[PDB]
Design an enzyme around this catalytic site. Sequence first.
Site, mmCIF file in Angstrom:
data_model
loop_
_atom_site.group_PDB
_atom_site.id
_atom_site.type_symbol
_atom_site.label_atom_id
_atom_site.label_comp_id
_atom_site.label_asym_id
_atom_site.label_seq_id
_atom_site.Cartn_x
_atom_site.Cartn_y
_atom_site.Cartn_z
ATOM 1 N N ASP A 34 11.585 5.581 -12.674
ATOM 2 C CA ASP A 34 10.502 6.195 -12.125
ATOM 3 C C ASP A 34 10.182 7.717 -12.262
ATOM 4 O O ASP A 34 11.278 8.583 -11.959
ATOM 5 C CB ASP A 34 10.814 5.937 -10.486
ATOM 6 C CG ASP A 34 9.480 6.562 -9.581
ATOM 7 O OD1 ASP A 34 8.599 6.839 -10.140
ATOM 8 O OD2 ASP A 34 9.795 6.911 -8.390
ATOM 9 N N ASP A 221 3.213 8.403 -12.835
ATOM 10 C CA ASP A 221 3.980 7.743 -11.961
ATOM 11 C C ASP A 221 4.548 6.281 -12.309
ATOM 12 O O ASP A 221 3.844 5.186 -12.103
ATOM 13 C CB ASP A 221 3.603 7.733 -10.584
ATOM 14 C CG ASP A 221 4.817 7.241 -9.685
ATOM 15 O OD1 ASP A 221 5.855 6.747 -9.975
ATOM 16 O OD2 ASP A 221 4.782 7.456 -8.349
HETATM 17 C C1 LIG Z 1 10.911 2.665 -4.290
HETATM 18 C C2 LIG Z 1 10.081 3.261 -5.236
HETATM 19 C C3 LIG Z 1 9.392 2.408 -6.631
HETATM 20 C C4 LIG Z 1 8.627 3.716 -4.489
HETATM 21 N N1 LIG Z 1 7.163 3.385 -5.149
HETATM 22 C C5 LIG Z 1 6.487 2.575 -5.227
HETATM 23 O O1 LIG Z 1 5.285 2.830 -5.896
HETATM 24 C C6 LIG Z 1 6.693 1.135 -4.754
HETATM 25 C C7 LIG Z 1 6.573 0.978 -3.548
HETATM 26 N N2 LIG Z 1 7.165 -0.063 -2.991
HETATM 27 C C8 LIG Z 1 7.114 -1.138 -3.880
HETATM 28 C C9 LIG Z 1 7.427 -2.611 -3.040
HETATM 29 C C10 LIG Z 1 8.800 -2.631 -2.471
HETATM 30 C C11 LIG Z 1 6.467 -2.873 -2.187
HETATM 31 C C12 LIG Z 1 7.722 -3.571 -4.208
HETATM 32 N N3 LIG Z 1 6.908 -1.154 -5.148
HETATM 33 C C13 LIG Z 1 6.916 -0.016 -5.936
HETATM 34 N N4 LIG Z 1 6.862 0.355 -7.221
HETATM 35 C C14 LIG Z 1 7.109 -0.985 -8.018
HETATM 36 C C15 LIG Z 1 6.664 -0.365 -9.418
HETATM 37 C C16 LIG Z 1 7.705 -0.837 -10.253
HETATM 38 C C17 LIG Z 1 7.288 -0.311 -11.322
HETATM 39 C C18 LIG Z 1 6.211 0.166 -11.411
HETATM 40 O O2 LIG Z 1 5.786 -0.092 -9.982
HETATM 41 C C19 LIG Z 1 6.838 4.958 -5.825
HETATM 42 C C20 LIG Z 1 7.119 6.194 -4.720
HETATM 43 C C21 LIG Z 1 6.589 7.403 -5.270
HETATM 44 C C22 LIG Z 1 7.726 7.792 -6.260
HETATM 45 N N5 LIG Z 1 7.235 6.628 -7.479
HETATM 46 C C23 LIG Z 1 7.546 5.243 -7.369
#
Ligand SMILES: CC(C)CN(C(=O)c1cnc(C(C)(C)C)nc1NCc1ccco1)[C@H]1CCCNC1
Length: 335
Positions: A34, A221
Amino acid sequence: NTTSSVILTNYMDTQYYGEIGIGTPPQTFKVVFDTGSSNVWVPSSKCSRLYTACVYHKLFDASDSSSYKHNGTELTLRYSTGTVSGFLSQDIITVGGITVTQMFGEVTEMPALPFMLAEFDGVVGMGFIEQAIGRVTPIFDNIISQGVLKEDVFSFYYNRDSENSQSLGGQIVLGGSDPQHYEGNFHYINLIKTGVWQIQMKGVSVGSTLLCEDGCLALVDTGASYISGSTSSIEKLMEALGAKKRLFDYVVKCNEGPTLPDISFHLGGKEYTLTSADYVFQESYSSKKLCTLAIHAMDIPPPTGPTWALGATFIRKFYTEFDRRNNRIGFALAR
Ligand SMILES: CC(C)CN(C(=O)c1cnc(C(C)(C)C)nc1NCc1ccco1)[C@H]1CCCNC1
Ligand SMILES: *[C@@H]1O[C@H](CO)[C@@H](O)[C@H](O)[C@H]1NC(C)=O
Protein backbone atom coordinates in the site's frame (compact mmCIF):
# COMPACT_ATOMS: atom_id res chain seq x y z
CA ASN A 1 22.61 -3.85 -7.70
CA THR A 2 19.85 -6.52 -7.78
CA THR A 3 16.13 -6.60 -8.68
CA SER A 4 13.24 -8.53 -7.07
CA SER A 5 9.53 -9.22 -7.61
CA VAL A 6 6.51 -10.20 -5.48
CA ILE A 7 3.78 -12.28 -7.20
CA LEU A 8 0.34 -10.79 -6.45
CA THR A 9 -3.07 -12.44 -6.30
CA ASN A 10 -6.02 -10.49 -7.74
CA TYR A 11 -9.25 -11.06 -5.83
CA MET A 12 -12.15 -9.78 -7.94
CA ASP A 13 -10.35 -6.58 -9.15
CA THR A 14 -10.70 -5.04 -5.66
CA GLN A 15 -8.07 -6.79 -3.56
CA TYR A 16 -4.45 -7.23 -4.65
CA TYR A 17 -2.03 -8.89 -2.26
CA GLY A 18 1.19 -10.88 -2.10
CA GLU A 19 2.85 -13.18 0.38
CA ILE A 20 5.48 -12.20 2.94
CA GLY A 21 7.17 -14.27 5.63
CA ILE A 22 7.59 -13.04 9.20
CA GLY A 23 9.93 -14.66 11.72
CA THR A 24 12.07 -17.74 12.22
CA PRO A 25 10.70 -19.99 10.92
CA PRO A 26 8.72 -17.83 8.41
CA GLN A 27 5.03 -17.36 9.20
CA THR A 28 3.47 -16.36 5.89
CA PHE A 29 0.89 -13.61 5.43
CA LYS A 30 -1.24 -12.25 2.64
CA VAL A 31 -0.42 -8.51 2.58
CA VAL A 32 -1.53 -5.45 0.63
CA PHE A 33 1.40 -3.43 -0.63
CA ASP A 34 0.00 0.00 0.00
CA THR A 35 1.55 3.26 -1.25
CA GLY A 36 -1.14 5.13 0.71
CA SER A 37 0.20 4.10 4.13
CA SER A 38 3.66 3.53 5.63
CA ASN A 39 3.23 0.91 8.39
CA VAL A 40 3.56 -2.87 8.30
CA TRP A 41 0.92 -4.79 10.22
CA VAL A 42 -0.37 -8.30 10.42
CA PRO A 43 -3.00 -9.63 12.84
CA SER A 44 -1.51 -10.88 16.12
CA SER A 45 -1.95 -14.07 18.18
CA LYS A 46 -2.67 -11.65 21.08
CA CYS A 47 -5.82 -10.53 19.21
CA SER A 48 -8.96 -11.50 21.13
CA ARG A 49 -10.90 -14.23 19.37
CA LEU A 50 -13.97 -12.07 19.96
CA TYR A 51 -12.62 -10.30 16.88
CA THR A 52 -14.01 -12.62 14.20
CA ALA A 53 -11.60 -11.07 11.67
CA CYS A 54 -8.80 -12.50 13.87
CA VAL A 55 -10.50 -15.91 13.71
CA TYR A 56 -10.56 -15.69 9.86
CA HIS A 57 -7.02 -14.46 9.16
CA LYS A 58 -3.48 -15.68 9.68
CA LEU A 59 -2.15 -14.52 13.07
CA PHE A 60 1.49 -13.73 13.84
CA ASP A 61 2.58 -15.73 16.82
CA ALA A 62 5.64 -14.11 18.42
CA SER A 63 5.93 -17.21 20.63
CA ASP A 64 6.74 -19.23 17.49
CA SER A 65 9.46 -16.90 16.24
CA SER A 66 13.04 -17.28 17.54
CA SER A 67 14.04 -13.97 15.90
CA TYR A 68 11.31 -11.80 17.47
CA LYS A 69 12.20 -8.66 19.41
CA HIS A 70 9.66 -7.24 21.86
CA ASN A 71 8.74 -3.57 21.82
CA GLY A 72 5.07 -3.35 22.74
CA THR A 73 4.49 0.35 22.05
CA GLU A 74 0.80 0.80 21.29
CA LEU A 75 -0.13 1.91 17.80
CA THR A 76 -3.44 2.77 16.16
CA LEU A 77 -3.64 2.90 12.39
CA ARG A 78 -6.58 4.98 11.22
CA TYR A 79 -7.42 4.33 7.60
CA SER A 80 -10.28 6.05 5.75
CA THR A 81 -12.32 2.80 5.66
CA GLY A 82 -11.61 1.52 9.18
CA THR A 83 -9.11 1.28 12.01
CA VAL A 84 -6.66 -1.35 13.26
CA SER A 85 -5.04 -1.16 16.68
CA GLY A 86 -2.27 -3.09 18.46
CA PHE A 87 1.41 -2.87 19.44
CA LEU A 88 4.88 -2.74 17.83
CA SER A 89 7.15 -5.73 17.33
CA GLN A 90 10.40 -6.43 15.52
CA ASP A 91 11.21 -9.49 13.45
CA ILE A 92 12.80 -10.60 10.19
CA ILE A 93 10.48 -10.09 7.18
CA THR A 94 11.04 -11.80 3.82
CA VAL A 95 9.67 -10.07 0.74
CA GLY A 96 10.65 -11.27 -2.76
CA GLY A 97 13.72 -13.07 -1.40
CA ILE A 98 14.84 -9.92 0.44
CA THR A 99 15.38 -10.45 4.17
CA VAL A 100 14.97 -7.34 6.33
CA THR A 101 14.75 -6.70 10.09
CA GLN A 102 11.60 -4.66 10.45
CA MET A 103 9.36 -3.01 13.07
CA PHE A 104 5.74 -3.94 12.39
CA GLY A 105 2.37 -3.70 14.14
CA GLU A 106 0.88 -6.76 15.78
CA VAL A 107 -2.82 -6.03 15.44
CA THR A 108 -4.85 -7.01 18.51
CA GLU A 109 -7.96 -5.06 17.50
CA MET A 110 -9.39 -5.83 14.08
CA PRO A 111 -13.07 -4.81 13.46
CA ALA A 112 -15.29 -7.38 11.75
CA LEU A 113 -16.33 -4.61 9.42
CA PRO A 114 -14.50 -4.05 7.23
CA PHE A 115 -11.86 -6.69 7.91
CA MET A 116 -14.00 -9.81 7.48
CA LEU A 117 -14.22 -8.68 3.84
CA ALA A 118 -10.41 -8.73 3.47
CA GLU A 119 -8.85 -11.65 1.64
CA PHE A 120 -5.49 -10.31 2.81
CA ASP A 121 -4.28 -10.65 6.41
CA GLY A 122 -2.41 -7.35 6.75
CA VAL A 123 -0.69 -4.40 5.09
CA VAL A 124 2.82 -3.58 3.95
CA GLY A 125 3.00 0.23 3.79
CA MET A 126 4.97 1.56 0.80
CA GLY A 127 4.75 5.22 1.86
CA PHE A 128 7.30 7.52 3.49
CA ILE A 129 8.44 7.74 7.14
CA GLU A 130 6.57 11.10 7.36
CA GLN A 131 3.22 9.26 7.15
CA ALA A 132 4.38 6.34 9.36
CA ILE A 133 2.48 6.09 12.66
CA GLY A 134 5.00 5.78 15.49
CA ARG A 135 7.71 7.17 13.16
CA VAL A 136 8.46 3.49 12.41
CA THR A 137 10.92 3.05 9.52
CA PRO A 138 8.93 1.67 6.52
CA ILE A 139 10.02 -1.61 4.91
CA PHE A 140 11.29 -0.05 1.66
CA ASP A 141 13.39 2.48 3.60
CA ASN A 142 14.90 -0.55 5.34
CA ILE A 143 15.55 -2.39 2.04
CA ILE A 144 17.21 0.76 0.59
CA SER A 145 19.51 0.89 3.67
CA GLN A 146 20.86 -2.57 2.78
CA GLY A 147 22.19 -1.27 -0.56
CA VAL A 148 21.03 -4.38 -2.46
CA LEU A 149 18.60 -2.84 -4.98
CA LYS A 150 19.58 -1.52 -8.42
CA GLU A 151 17.40 1.60 -8.05
CA ASP A 152 15.55 3.53 -5.34
CA VAL A 153 12.28 2.60 -7.12
CA PHE A 154 9.39 0.15 -6.94
CA SER A 155 6.76 -0.68 -9.55
CA PHE A 156 3.18 -1.98 -9.60
CA TYR A 157 1.44 -4.09 -12.18
CA TYR A 158 -2.23 -4.93 -11.47
CA ASN A 159 -3.83 -7.41 -13.87
CA ARG A 160 -7.29 -6.88 -15.36
CA ASP A 161 -7.95 -10.62 -15.12
CA SER A 162 -9.05 -12.04 -11.75
CA GLU A 163 -11.16 -14.97 -13.04
CA ASN A 164 -8.46 -16.80 -15.04
CA SER A 165 -6.43 -18.42 -12.24
CA GLN A 166 -3.78 -19.65 -14.74
CA SER A 167 -2.60 -16.01 -15.15
CA LEU A 168 -0.58 -13.49 -13.07
CA GLY A 169 -2.88 -11.52 -10.72
CA GLY A 170 -0.30 -8.76 -10.23
CA GLN A 171 3.38 -7.99 -9.64
CA ILE A 172 5.60 -5.66 -7.61
CA VAL A 173 9.17 -5.16 -8.76
CA LEU A 174 11.41 -3.87 -5.98
CA GLY A 175 14.39 -1.98 -7.43
CA GLY A 176 13.07 -1.43 -10.97
CA SER A 177 10.18 -2.02 -13.36
CA ASP A 178 9.21 -5.03 -15.53
CA PRO A 179 9.09 -4.31 -19.32
CA GLN A 180 6.96 -7.45 -19.90
CA HIS A 181 4.09 -5.59 -18.13
CA TYR A 182 4.30 -2.07 -19.62
CA GLU A 183 4.64 -0.45 -23.08
CA GLY A 184 5.47 2.97 -24.52
CA ASN A 185 7.47 5.43 -22.45
CA PHE A 186 7.03 6.36 -18.84
CA HIS A 187 5.43 9.72 -18.10
CA TYR A 188 6.97 11.16 -14.93
CA ILE A 189 5.08 13.41 -12.55
CA ASN A 190 6.90 14.99 -9.59
CA LEU A 191 5.27 14.88 -6.14
CA ILE A 192 3.80 17.97 -4.44
CA LYS A 193 5.92 17.12 -1.41
CA THR A 194 8.14 14.33 -0.15
CA GLY A 195 6.34 12.35 2.57
CA VAL A 196 3.34 11.33 0.43
CA TRP A 197 2.78 9.60 -2.95
CA GLN A 198 0.64 12.55 -4.06
CA ILE A 199 0.68 14.48 -7.33
CA GLN A 200 -0.95 17.66 -8.71
CA MET A 201 -4.16 17.09 -10.66
CA LYS A 202 -5.48 19.86 -12.89
CA GLY A 203 -8.76 18.34 -14.13
CA VAL A 204 -11.33 15.55 -13.93
CA SER A 205 -13.33 15.27 -17.17
CA VAL A 206 -16.57 13.48 -18.01
CA GLY A 207 -16.67 13.01 -21.81
CA SER A 208 -15.50 18.53 -21.08
CA THR A 209 -13.83 19.37 -17.73
CA LEU A 210 -16.38 19.74 -14.91
CA LEU A 211 -14.30 18.87 -11.82
CA CYS A 212 -10.93 19.85 -10.28
CA GLU A 213 -10.87 23.09 -12.32
CA ASP A 214 -8.74 25.20 -9.94
CA GLY A 215 -6.51 22.18 -9.28
CA CYS A 216 -6.76 19.42 -6.69
CA LEU A 217 -4.70 16.58 -5.22
CA ALA A 218 -4.26 12.98 -6.39
CA LEU A 219 -2.87 10.30 -4.07
CA VAL A 220 -1.57 7.28 -5.99
CA ASP A 221 -2.78 4.49 -3.73
CA THR A 222 -1.94 0.88 -4.66
CA GLY A 223 -3.76 -0.21 -1.50
CA ALA A 224 -7.12 1.16 -2.67
CA SER A 225 -9.61 -0.71 -4.85
CA TYR A 226 -11.09 2.28 -6.58
CA ILE A 227 -10.70 5.79 -7.84
CA SER A 228 -11.96 7.93 -5.00
CA GLY A 229 -12.65 11.63 -4.57
CA SER A 230 -14.35 13.80 -1.95
CA THR A 231 -18.09 13.26 -1.22
CA SER A 232 -18.98 16.49 -3.11
CA SER A 233 -16.51 15.64 -5.93
CA ILE A 234 -18.06 12.20 -6.36
CA GLU A 235 -21.70 13.38 -6.07
CA LYS A 236 -21.07 15.80 -8.99
CA LEU A 237 -19.18 13.14 -11.02
CA MET A 238 -22.03 10.68 -10.47
CA GLU A 239 -24.86 13.12 -11.28
CA ALA A 240 -23.01 13.59 -14.59
CA LEU A 241 -22.95 9.79 -15.13
CA GLY A 242 -26.61 9.21 -14.15
CA ALA A 243 -25.48 6.83 -11.41
CA LYS A 244 -27.75 6.23 -8.40
CA LYS A 245 -26.10 6.44 -4.95
CA ARG A 246 -26.17 3.41 -2.69
CA LEU A 247 -24.92 2.62 0.82
CA PHE A 248 -21.29 1.74 -0.05
CA ASP A 249 -21.06 2.14 -3.84
CA TYR A 250 -22.52 3.83 -6.91
CA VAL A 251 -24.43 1.90 -9.57
CA VAL A 252 -25.92 2.23 -13.02
CA LYS A 253 -28.45 -0.12 -14.61
CA CYS A 254 -26.17 -2.71 -16.27
CA ASN A 255 -27.41 -1.97 -19.80
CA GLU A 256 -26.36 1.70 -19.44
CA GLY A 257 -22.78 0.62 -18.63
CA PRO A 258 -21.14 0.46 -22.11
CA THR A 259 -22.85 3.80 -23.03
CA LEU A 260 -21.15 5.59 -20.08
CA PRO A 261 -18.71 8.37 -21.13
CA ASP A 262 -14.93 8.35 -20.69
CA ILE A 263 -13.52 9.81 -17.47
CA SER A 264 -10.21 11.66 -17.76
CA PHE A 265 -7.64 12.71 -15.14
CA HIS A 266 -5.36 15.62 -16.07
CA LEU A 267 -2.02 14.61 -14.58
CA GLY A 268 1.32 16.26 -15.33
CA GLY A 269 -0.06 17.88 -18.49
CA LYS A 270 -1.38 14.59 -19.92
CA GLU A 271 -4.98 13.36 -20.04
CA TYR A 272 -5.26 9.90 -18.39
CA THR A 273 -8.47 8.46 -19.78
CA LEU A 274 -10.59 5.59 -18.51
CA THR A 275 -13.36 4.12 -20.66
CA SER A 276 -16.51 2.63 -19.08
CA ALA A 277 -14.82 -0.78 -19.55
CA ASP A 278 -12.07 0.44 -17.19
CA TYR A 279 -14.52 1.51 -14.42
CA VAL A 280 -17.83 -0.43 -14.75
CA PHE A 281 -18.07 -3.92 -13.28
CA GLN A 282 -20.06 -5.28 -16.27
CA GLU A 283 -21.50 -8.27 -14.38
CA SER A 284 -24.55 -8.21 -16.73
CA TYR A 285 -26.22 -6.33 -19.64
CA SER A 286 -29.72 -6.51 -18.12
CA SER A 287 -31.99 -3.50 -17.52
CA LYS A 288 -33.27 -5.39 -14.42
CA LYS A 289 -29.73 -5.63 -12.95
CA LEU A 290 -27.53 -3.03 -11.19
CA CYS A 291 -23.83 -2.78 -12.05
CA THR A 292 -21.37 -1.31 -9.58
CA LEU A 293 -18.85 1.42 -10.50
CA ALA A 294 -15.16 1.29 -9.53
CA ILE A 295 -15.32 4.88 -8.22
CA HIS A 296 -16.56 5.79 -4.73
CA ALA A 297 -16.64 8.64 -2.19
CA MET A 298 -13.70 8.60 0.25
CA ASP A 299 -13.08 11.64 2.44
CA ILE A 300 -9.45 11.67 3.54
CA PRO A 301 -8.69 14.28 6.30
CA PRO A 302 -5.85 16.88 6.54
CA PRO A 303 -2.96 17.05 6.04
CA THR A 304 -3.15 14.46 3.17
CA GLY A 305 -6.70 15.52 2.24
CA PRO A 306 -9.09 16.36 0.93
CA THR A 307 -7.76 14.42 -2.09
CA TRP A 308 -8.51 12.08 -4.95
CA ALA A 309 -7.02 8.61 -4.71
CA LEU A 310 -5.99 6.65 -7.80
CA GLY A 311 -6.39 3.01 -6.74
CA ALA A 312 -6.54 -0.35 -8.51
CA THR A 313 -9.07 0.94 -11.11
CA PHE A 314 -6.32 3.36 -12.26
CA ILE A 315 -3.23 1.13 -11.80
CA ARG A 316 -4.85 -1.65 -13.89
CA LYS A 317 -4.67 0.60 -16.95
CA PHE A 318 -1.48 2.41 -15.89
CA TYR A 319 1.64 0.53 -14.81
CA THR A 320 3.07 2.63 -12.00
CA GLU A 321 6.68 3.29 -11.06
CA PHE A 322 7.34 4.88 -7.68
CA ASP A 323 10.63 6.75 -7.78
CA ARG A 324 12.08 7.52 -4.35
CA ARG A 325 15.41 8.90 -5.61
CA ASN A 326 13.69 11.64 -7.65
CA ASN A 327 10.40 11.94 -5.67
CA ARG A 328 8.21 11.26 -8.70
CA ILE A 329 5.69 8.77 -10.07
CA GLY A 330 5.91 7.23 -13.55
CA PHE A 331 2.88 6.01 -15.48
CA ALA A 332 3.11 3.76 -18.53
CA LEU A 333 0.36 1.73 -20.24
CA ALA A 334 0.09 -1.73 -18.66
CA ARG A 335 0.01 -4.95 -20.75
C1 LIG B 1 -6.48 -1.90 4.96
C2 LIG B 1 -6.06 -0.94 3.85
C3 LIG B 1 -5.70 -1.76 2.60
C4 LIG B 1 -7.18 0.10 3.67
N1 LIG B 1 -7.40 0.76 2.35
C5 LIG B 1 -8.29 0.28 1.43
O1 LIG B 1 -8.46 0.87 0.37
C6 LIG B 1 -9.11 -0.94 1.65
C7 LIG B 1 -10.05 -0.92 2.68
N2 LIG B 1 -10.81 -1.97 2.92
C8 LIG B 1 -10.73 -3.06 2.17
C9 LIG B 1 -11.64 -4.23 2.51
C10 LIG B 1 -11.27 -4.76 3.90
C11 LIG B 1 -13.11 -3.79 2.50
C12 LIG B 1 -11.49 -5.39 1.53
N3 LIG B 1 -9.87 -3.12 1.16
C13 LIG B 1 -9.04 -2.11 0.85
N4 LIG B 1 -8.16 -2.22 -0.21
C14 LIG B 1 -7.92 -3.50 -0.90
C15 LIG B 1 -6.89 -3.37 -1.99
C16 LIG B 1 -5.78 -4.11 -2.12
C17 LIG B 1 -5.11 -3.64 -3.28
C18 LIG B 1 -5.85 -2.64 -3.79
O2 LIG B 1 -6.93 -2.48 -3.00
C19 LIG B 1 -6.69 2.02 2.00
C20 LIG B 1 -6.73 3.06 3.16
C21 LIG B 1 -5.97 4.34 2.78
C22 LIG B 1 -4.52 3.98 2.45
N5 LIG B 1 -4.51 3.04 1.31
C23 LIG B 1 -5.25 1.78 1.53
C1 LIG C 1 10.55 0.52 21.16
O1 LIG C 1 11.29 1.02 20.02
C2 LIG C 1 11.93 2.31 20.15
C3 LIG C 1 12.72 2.58 18.87
O2 LIG C 1 12.50 3.94 18.48
C4 LIG C 1 12.82 2.39 21.40
O3 LIG C 1 13.32 3.71 21.61
C5 LIG C 1 12.05 1.93 22.64
O4 LIG C 1 12.92 1.93 23.77
C6 LIG C 1 11.45 0.53 22.41
N1 LIG C 1 10.77 0.07 23.62
C7 LIG C 1 10.98 -1.14 24.16
C8 LIG C 1 10.20 -1.43 25.40
O5 LIG C 1 11.75 -1.96 23.69
